[PDB]
């Protein structure tokens, strides 16, 4: 979580012990159930946990898409999320192949 | 009657778009979750409501039979879509809070 | 965007290869990738006829994604 | 055992099918089970819950 822009910006600056609310889902719960929202969220954290900078490249590619002043995650449409979940999905596999040096066609689907 | 006699949408193109109406209504009712508190959605046991698809009867009607149908068989309307509508909305259409009404229990079930 | 503004602007009124290789001049036939013919092109269509048939499939597939929902009924 | 009985019983599973055939509902994709898992789907039951992470 600390690898996100906003949350690091709050936790670095704050000089007092304090509580801060955020909404992790921005406004995703208009068009998305809590289930799939939590699912995408854990995917966006797992790709930020591992690669970091190269995941943040996947998020911040197009500057035309802008994070609002309220939200954390940049405001996409549904289809842009459907592709970005596939890229963020890809980093986990390419990185896994880099780490254990397993060409990834050698794995069973369950293993993926 | 084809109530649009003033346009050929081939020549003129489609002269209106009501797409936004559908979302704005959906948030006038309280969003998709509170809408689905009134349904059997949880009974089905699906996880997320996002990809639900209702069978479109437009498919197979042609090949039912031809000569054979009896008058009622051919002309009468099928009760099957209304039953689908009252299953999906059942827990509101059947609710105990009612102003005036009497309990019955079905024969072999525990359904009031 | 940029175009639009720099255009819809009163002030404006007052005032070719990716690798620098020579490029054609006149309008070329359209293409899948938008590549522009080399400065040396004679200007005659020479084609098997495929490149146009890919558009017909391209338009088709792109159309029946819309037609499928809109023609749906019940 | 109840977590595993809700998803097992042929009788229950025949309610869940028979309702669907009653409602005439289908879910697109079929990947869905390629996503997440059983005890995962537990959290979203309405009761109120929290998570805590002390790594930071």
């Amino acid at each position: 979580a600390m690898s996100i822009d906003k949350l690091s910006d709050v936790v670095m600056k704050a000089t007092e012990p304090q509580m801060v609310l955020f909404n992790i889902y921005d406004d995703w719960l208009d068009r998305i159930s809590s289930y799939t929202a939590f699912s995408r969220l854990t995917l966006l954290l797992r790709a930020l946990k591992t690669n970091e900078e190269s995941a943040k490249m996947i998020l911040l590619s197009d500057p035309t898409i802008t994070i609002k002043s309220y939200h954390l995650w940049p405001s996409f449409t549904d289809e842009q999320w459907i592709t970005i979940e596939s890229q963020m999905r890809d980093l986990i596999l390419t990185e896994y192949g880099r780490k254990y040096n397993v060409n990834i066609s050698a794995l069973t689907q369950t293993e993926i | 009657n084809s109530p649009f006699w003033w346009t050929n949408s081939h020549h003129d193109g489609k002269l209106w778009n009501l797409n936004a109406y559908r979302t704005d209504v959906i948030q006038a009712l309280g969003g998709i979750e509170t809408i689905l508190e009134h349904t059997l959605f949880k009974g089905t046991g699906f996880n997320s409501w996002e990809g639900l698809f209702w069978e479109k009867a437009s498919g197979f009607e042609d090949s039912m039979q031809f000569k054979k149908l009896t008058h009622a068989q051919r002309t009468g309307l099928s009760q099957i879509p209304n039953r689908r509508f009252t299953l999906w909305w059942s827990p509101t259409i059947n609710r105990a809070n009612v102003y005036v009404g009497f309990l019955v229990q079905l024969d072999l079930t525990g359904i009031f | 965007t940029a175009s639009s503004l720099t255009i819809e602007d009163p002030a404006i009124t007052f005032t070719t290869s990716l690798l620098g290789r020579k490029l054609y001049d006149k309008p070329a036939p359209e293409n899948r990738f938008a590549i522009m013919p080399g400065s040396r092109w004679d200007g005659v269509h020479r084609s098997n006829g495929f490149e146009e048939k890919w558009f017909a499939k391209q338009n088709e597939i792109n159309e029946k994604k819309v037609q499928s929902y809109t023609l749906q009924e019940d | 055992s109840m977590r595993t009985i809700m998803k097992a019983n042929p009788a229950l599973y025949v309610l869940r099918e028979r309702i669907r055939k009653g409602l005439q509902i289908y879910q697109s994709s079929v990947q869905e089970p390629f996503l997440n898992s059983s005890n995962y789907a537990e959290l979203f039951n309405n009761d109120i819950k929290l998570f805590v992470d002390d790594t930071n």
Binding site: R31, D78, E79, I82, E85, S86, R89, D90, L93, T94, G97, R98, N103, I104, S105, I112 | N19, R22, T23, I26, E50, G51, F53 | K65, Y69 | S28, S29, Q31, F34
Partner: peptide, 25 residues
Amino acid sequence: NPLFVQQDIESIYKTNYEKLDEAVN
């Protein structure tokens, strides 16, 4: 339009074994 992409998208995630094998090595 369908109210939800997820209907119109026809598919969600189909892993490509060819690109990953190139990207890994």
